[PDB]
Design a protein around this ligand. Structure first.
Ligand SMILES: O=C(O)[C@H](O)[C@@H](O)[C@@H](O)C(=O)NO
Ligand SMILES: O=C(O)[C@H](O)[C@@H](O)[C@@H](O)C(=O)NO
Ligand SMILES: [Mg+2]
Ligand SMILES: [Mg+2]
Ligand SMILES: [Mg+2]
Ligand SMILES: [Mg+2]
Lengths: 384, 384
């Protein structure tokens, strides 16, 4: 009975970061400040622990007490499928409070617990495909910061820097509200043209555009991208409209990738395959409710001979990418010329995703998710 | 480097069984006799081992030397996805010698090795869903043995015995060549009616018919089954014809389950979903080339909200069933009134799939695949 879960705990602590998020939820660099971060811990009878990080609201007491503890406490931690399905079945009646984000942090903590318990990296437990993987440099949303990402020329200069760092692929996130003049398709294309000019034809280029363009605007964006040899166009329209994506993919020659933000996990992603709403599937640990369903989405895509690109940085997504074949990249970012991604986080002693000068991220040979957690820092910086 | 594979070994031994296979490959009870059986062993630097069983031809020297050793030796055994994909990529150029059967035994041995190494049952490593599962009694193909499975009445009598044993579901395999008069749709339906009469309306009933009926004969069989409230019809036609199954499913009200024997693993099974060639998907460790791709098939089906029923008995299939939700049964069989399934095999010290009196199979709490191997018996009974 050493494998039985005895405790579920949340520690909220302050992290110092220059990353801010605007009113729409987009990241930007700004003043160094302290932000509240949460760590979820699952503990078993024998004292073994698994941990994962998320925003405090996602693991607030309402959610832990009403849903999470009731599913987990007293259960064999290795029954990840049963526990995941139990939590999933409680979402419908949760008054919209038990979200996929909550499922994700719980599932990740359970995987970390299994890996730490067995002394195994998560991707090795799943069944490894690769120990290193190419990363694309994922550029932060556009801004109005002088020398930052304010002009098309700003994107081109930053792209040169990224190529020097070793990235073999680069993804632009272009301008979005509340940027004063945004969005504008012509501006987005000028940024794309500036980057292509700067890096030449042998660097892979992708764009993740304003996410609420009309069909006609997304069509015009896509056409412009084809002339620049871009590899994909990502989420240029509201993904709640499967039909719009079917239409856009049918019209555009450039591959459309998605859905990133759509609900319904692997079940709804199957519908994207069936409807021909994308050329390349998308998944992500946070987007589909954990490592467990992310793996399902990867397998789903593979059975159709499709790639499925994994949204998001951090260990949880890196381990999905390392355990699977049909994904071209790990997404490393978001990046901005004002910030140094390789500096990491104050609550981690080292990077979860270090990248060599050839543009390969090497999965750390550390058990569980391999997050090198600075528990002392977290204790010294507690809120609640 | 303790996890590096150092050896791949095959031991052929004699097992005493009353099971024979006719020239078409169907099992029947006959004289007790000795049959050659193979055990594949994968060993790592630290001396840890994983084992799996198969027919000797499937792991003969040609296949071990030309393919299996070249992929496995010197590799981290935990890289199951990489090793599986490497073997898969060698099938095309293998002059038809590297079969899904070979991939399956290799993948199974790798899973057993991981589980044994960590002291974990394979389904717990994957991520457990259930520790016990309902089994259906899977009845051997029909025969011409008096009191065996020679008449419709014989099926009904055997079905009564199975309900007493605890089975909540029963699947008939009906008469096939080389049975002298077979096949015959009206006889198949007489057997089905005899079973329904014997067990009443609350036992679930399935049929797996002669596998090469024409469209029109399978249609007639299906219509007949609908009047008897059967749960599914399985492989009544050549599965090489996806179109025939789409037609049959569209015409029949009774659920069609498949494909069992079709090649192409999870990739081809996706096409069965897309074409609507079945109502319930089918997979099996031996049919799709291992535990790894059987899991993929289960996930594929789950994303479409479908069940995927797992073909075959033994530990390897039981662990797939135990790790997943969208499968109603474990297939326990093949069964015949002349044989006692619960007697097991001479080369296993106990059953991999013991069933309680309520018809639940309990997954053994033993590491790896949990096969309780009698290594001493195997050594005393060696051939090569
Ligand atoms: O609009 C945004 O903030 C970005 O699209 C963001 O969600 C980013 O993480 C993304 O979509 N990457 O692929
Ligand atoms: O034809 C046979 O021998 C049976 O159909 C056999 O393949 C059996 O294992 C099966 O199909 N079970 O579902
Ligand atoms: Mg995106
Ligand atoms: Mg297109
Ligand atoms: Mg069958
Ligand atoms: Mg039908």
């Amino acid at each position: 009975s050493h494998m039985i879960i005895t405790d579920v705990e949340v520690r909220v602590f302050r992290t110092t970061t220059r990353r801010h998020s605007d009113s729409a939820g987009h990241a930007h660099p700004g003043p160094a400040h302290q932000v509240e971060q949460a760590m979820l811990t699952v503990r078993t009878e024998d004292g073994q622990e698994g941990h994962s990080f998320t925003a405090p609201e996602i693991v607030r007491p309402h959610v832990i007490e009403k849903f999470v503890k009731k599913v987990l406490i007293g259960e064999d931690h290795r029954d990840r499928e049963r526990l995941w399905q139990d939590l999933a079945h409680w979402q419908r009646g949760s008054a919209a409070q038990l979200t996929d984000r909550t499922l994700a942090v719980v599932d990740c903590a359970l995987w970390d617990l299994a890996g730490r318990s067995l002394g195994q990296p998560v991707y090795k437990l799943i069944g490894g495909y690769r120990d290193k993987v190419l990363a694309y440099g994922s550029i932060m949303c556009g801004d109005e910061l002088e020398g930052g990402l304010a002009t098309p020329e700003d994107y081109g200069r930053f792209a040169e820097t990224l190529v020097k760092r070793g990235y073999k692929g680069i993804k632009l996130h272009t301008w979005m509200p509340p940027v004063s003049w945004a969005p504008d398709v012509k501006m987005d294309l000028k940024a794309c043209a500036a980057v292509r000019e700067a890096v030449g034809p042998d660097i892979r280029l992708m764009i993740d555009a304003f996410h609420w363009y009309s069909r006609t605007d997304a069509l015009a964006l896509g056409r412009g991208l084809e002339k620049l040899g871009f590899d994909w166009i990502e989420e240029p329209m509201d993904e709640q409209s499967l039909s719009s994506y079917k239409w856009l993919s049918d019209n555009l020659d450039i591959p459309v990738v998605g859905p990133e933000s759509a609900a319904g996990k692997h079940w709804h992603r199957a519908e994207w395959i069936k409807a021909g709403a994308c050329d390349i599937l998308r998944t992500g640990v946070n987007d589909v409710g954990g490592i467990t369903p992310a793996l399902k989405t990867m397998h789903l895509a593979e059975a159709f001979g499709m790639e499925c690109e994994v949204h998001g940085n951090t260990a949880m997504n890196l381990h999905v990418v390392a355990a699977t074949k049909n994904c071209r990249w790990y997404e490393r970012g978001l990046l901005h010329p004002f910030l140094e991604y390789d500096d990491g986080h104050d609550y981690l002693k080292s990077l979860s995703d270090p990248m060599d000068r050839d543009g390969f991220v090497h999965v750390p040979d550390r058990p569980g998710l391999g997050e090198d957690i600075d528990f002392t820092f977290i204790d010294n910086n507690r809120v609640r």
